[PDB]
Amino acid sequence: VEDWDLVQTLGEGAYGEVQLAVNRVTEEAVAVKIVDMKRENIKKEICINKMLNHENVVKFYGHRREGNIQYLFLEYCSGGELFDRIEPDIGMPEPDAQRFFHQLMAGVVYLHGIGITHRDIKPENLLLDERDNLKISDFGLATVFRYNNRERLLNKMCGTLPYVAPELLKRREFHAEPVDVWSCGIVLTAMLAGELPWDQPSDSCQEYSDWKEKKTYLNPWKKIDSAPLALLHKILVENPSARITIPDIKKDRWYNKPLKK
Numbered sequence: 001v002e003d004w005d006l007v008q009t010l011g012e013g014a015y016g017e018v019q020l021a022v023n024r025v026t027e028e029a030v031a032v033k034i035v036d037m038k039r040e041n042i043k044k045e046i047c048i049n050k051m052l053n054h055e056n057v058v059k060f061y062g063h064r065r066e067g068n069i070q071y072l073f074l075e076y077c078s079g080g081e082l083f084d085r086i087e088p089d090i091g092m093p094e095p096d097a098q099r100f101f102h103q104l105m106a107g108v109v110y111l112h113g114i115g116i117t118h119r120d121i122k123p124e125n126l127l128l129d130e131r132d133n134l135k136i137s138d139f140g141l142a143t144v145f146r147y148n149n150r151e152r153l154l155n156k157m158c159g160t161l162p163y164v165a166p167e168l169l170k171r172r173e174f175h176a177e178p179v180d181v182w183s184c185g186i187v188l189t190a191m192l193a194g195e196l197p198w199d200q201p202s203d204s205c206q207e208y209s210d211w212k213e214k215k216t217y218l219n220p221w222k223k224i225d226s227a228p229l230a231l232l233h234k235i236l237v238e239n240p241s242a243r244i245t246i247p248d249i250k251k252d253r254w255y256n257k258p259l260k261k
């Protein structure tokens with residue numbers, strides 16, 4: 001009634017590889033993430049996962065260790081990665097991007113309300129269930145940034161360069177929440193344009209300098225309608241203190257635009 005055949009490999013998490021596992025008896029499907037502690041940073045992932053319960057967060061069912069092998073038992077999302085819904089050079093229909101973005105923000109508000117920062121928000125880590133509902137996955141790089149109501153600044157560089165905020169390259173210490181916001185902005189750009197705007201947010205990238213100089217007649221920006229673009233102007237702001245926060249994202253005109261049946 002509860003041993004699982006590992007039916008196929010789904011890919012790799014930040015730590016370990018994920019398999020689709022099917023219950024021989026009940027036919028129930030879960031994802032099993034398999035982490036070779038040999039061939040602590042994983043302990044934290046398990047710890048963080050036990051705090052989480054939200055409809056836009058990949059459910060954690062339990063863990064079992066067998067030798068040097070940690071298994072984490074996670075919600076299977078049969079829709080796969082948001083990454084695979086993004087057409088290269090094209091993006092996806094604006095109403096689809098909006099609903100995904102709304103679902104992203106719900107999950108991120110949730111994390112940040114319990115004091116957790118994800119730190120590697122990108123389409124490969126955003127999963128779709130059978131109803132195309134988005135779930136945030138993979139807490140391998142996640143960390144506590146608020147505890148007993150006191151914030152701590154982050155100092156370690158974590159994340160994926162095209163998605164990372166510029167302060168994380170430029171400051172010894174920085175606030176966790178505007179990092180996650182920025183990376184949500186790069187995801188929205190990807191969804192609406194089917195391309196990433198720069199290799200990293202450095203003045204050393206021409207495309208990044210072009211964005212700061214507001215050359216929005218260039219790609220990817222010219223593919224994006226004026227209303228979402230105006231949101232991206234407020235998310236992709238280099239100084240993290242002047243960057244829009246989630247409460248204000250939720251007030252944004254595109255965010256609230258009716259689009260989708």
Ligand SMILES: Cc1n[nH]c(-c2nc3cc(C(C)C)ccc3[nH]2)c1C(=O)NC1CCN(C)CC1
Binds near residue numbers: 011018075079
């Ligand atoms: C925890 C989880 N639940 N469901 C899926 C999943 N369901 C999936 C369903 C499919 C379908 C299209 C067969 C494909 C991948 C899927 N992943 C995963 C998972 O971690 N996938 C990782 C995410 C990172 N990637 C870098 C590698 C893969």
